[PDB]
Amino acid sequence: CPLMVKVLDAVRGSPAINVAVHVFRKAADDTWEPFASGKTSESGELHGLTTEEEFVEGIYKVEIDTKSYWKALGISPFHEHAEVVFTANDSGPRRYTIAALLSPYSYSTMAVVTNP
Amino acid sequence: CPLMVKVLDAVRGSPAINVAVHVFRKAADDTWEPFASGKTSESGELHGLTTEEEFVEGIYKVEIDTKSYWKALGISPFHEHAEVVFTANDSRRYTIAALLSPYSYSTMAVVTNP
Amino acid sequence: CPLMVKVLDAVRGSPAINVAVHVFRKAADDTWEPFASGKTSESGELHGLTTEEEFVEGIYKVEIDTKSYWKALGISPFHEHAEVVFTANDSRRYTIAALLSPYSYSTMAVVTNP
Amino acid sequence: CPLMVKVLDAVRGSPAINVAVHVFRKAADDTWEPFASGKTSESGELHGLTTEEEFVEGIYKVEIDTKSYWKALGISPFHEHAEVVFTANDSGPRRYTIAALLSPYSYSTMAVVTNP
Numbered sequence A, D: 001c002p003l004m005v006k007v008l009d010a011v012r013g014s015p016a017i018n019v020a021v022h023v024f025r026k027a028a029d030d031t032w033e034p035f036a037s038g039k040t041s042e043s044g045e046l047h048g049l050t051t052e053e054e055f056v057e058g059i060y061k062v063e064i065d066t067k068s069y070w071k072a073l074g075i076s077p078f079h080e081h082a083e084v085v086f087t088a089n090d091s092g093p094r095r096y097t098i099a100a101l102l103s104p105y106s107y108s109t110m111a112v113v114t115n116p
Numbered sequence B, C: 001c002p003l004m005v006k007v008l009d010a011v012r013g014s015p016a017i018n019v020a021v022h023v024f025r026k027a028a029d030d031t032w033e034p035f036a037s038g039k040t041s042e043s044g045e046l047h048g049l050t051t052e053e054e055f056v057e058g059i060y061k062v063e064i065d066t067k068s069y070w071k072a073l074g075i076s077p078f079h080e081h082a083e084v085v086f087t088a089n090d091s092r093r094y095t096i097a098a099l100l101s102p103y104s105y106s107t108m109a110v111v112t113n114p
Helices: A066-071 B066-072 C066-072 D066-071
Strands: A003-009 A020-026 A032-039 A058-064 A079-088 A095-103 A106-114 B003-009 B020-026 B032-039 B058-064 B079-088 B093-101 B104-112 C003-009 C020-026 C032-039 C058-064 C079-088 C093-101 C104-112 D003-009 D020-026 D032-039 D058-064 D079-088 D095-103 D106-114
Touching (some): A003 A020, A003 A058, B066 B079, B079 B104, C066 C093, D003 D058, D066 D079, D079 D095, D079 D106
Parallel strands (some): A003 A095, C003 C093
Antiparallel strands (some): A058 A079, A095 A106, A106 B104, B020 B058, C020 C032, C093 C104, D020 D032, D020 D058
C-alpha cells in the first residue's frame, strides 16, 4: 500500500469510522486534480487508494472530511476538514501512512514514510 | 483582534519565528481569495490580520508556511504547509494555534467571547 | 514567573478553567515532594506557582487533574490525570501547555530566555 | 492483546524503535508496583506485556522512557518520560492501545479502548 490513511476519534477513544477522504494531485497548471477517494473502515483505516504505478512524483493533498464526521455524532466542530499537503516520491517510491487524531476543535496529523 | 495565529516549534521548544502566514476567504465561485497575511513575531504570534468590520461570516483558510521554516533550519520536513480551514460564525475572538514538528503538526482553535 | 501552566479544552475550543494543578519536586530519596499548586484561571492559565529563588535545578512533575475536569462536564475520560515530568536547567522561563481531549492529550514546553 | 503500546517519532516520520516502556499498577497501599515492561520493536509496537487473566481492574501507569530515546539520537529533550495513567477494566475486560507521538519538546498520547 503506497498510501494509507488512518483516522482516530479522541472523544470516543476509537477509530473514526466512515470518514470520507479525498486525495488530489497538483497538475501542471497548478490546479488540484482529483486523484483518489474513499472512506475509512471499522478500523479507521482507508486502504487501496492507489497503486505503485499510479502514485508518481507530485504534490498531493489528502482532505479528511472531519466536519461531516462530527456533525453526524451531534457535534458542531471548528474545522471544515483536515488537509495534509506533501510532496511524494521525489526521491523514488515510498510508502506513506497519514494519520489524523480528531477532536472537535483540534486535530493532529502525523506521517510515517517508509522505503519498501 | 478577531483573528490571531500562534505557531510553536516542538523540536526546539520555542516560538516559531518569522513564519509566513496567508489567510484566504472563500469566494462565491468557490475559489480562495487572498484576505490577509504576515509573518510571526519573536513570540510566534501574528496579530492585526483583520478587523471586526472586515471579518464577516464565511469560510476562511489559514495557510502556514511550515516547509520554508524547517528548510531555513536545515531540517527536512514532510508537509508543504499547514492548512486550517474553518467557518467564521457570528454569535468572539479566534485564536488558531499550530504546534510544528518535521513530520507532524497539531492545530487547535480557541474561540472566546469578550 | 519561571513556571507557567496553560490548559486548553479541545472539545469546546476554550481555556480549561478551574483545573487543579499540582507541582512536585523530586527529593533525594526519589520521592515526590509537594512544591506548588493552584487552579487554572478563566484564561486556562496558572501563574505565580514559584519564584526564581525557589525554582532551582532538579526534576519536577506537573500533575494536571484532567479526570475531575471532564467529570464535572459530564464527559467520560480516559486518564486519571496528565503528568509532565522534566528537569529544570540553568543556562529562562518555562511554559507547560496541555491540550485536553477525553481520550487524548498533547503537551508542549516552551522554554524562553528573557 | 489486552494492552499494547505504540510509539512514533515526529522528527523522523518513523516508528520509535527500542523505546523502553515500564508499566505499574497501583497497589492497596497506594504505591506503584511494577507490573510489566518491554521495548518497542521495529514497528514501534510493544506486544505481549500482559494477559487477560493478569490484567485485572486497577489503576495503571505506562511510563515511556522518551528521554533515553532522544539522547541516543543526539537530541536533548524536555521530558524525562511520557506517563499515561488510567483506570483499566473497571466495567469488565477491555483491550487498550496506548499510542504516543514524540517530539523533543512535546508529545501526544491517545488511547483506543475496544470491547473484545
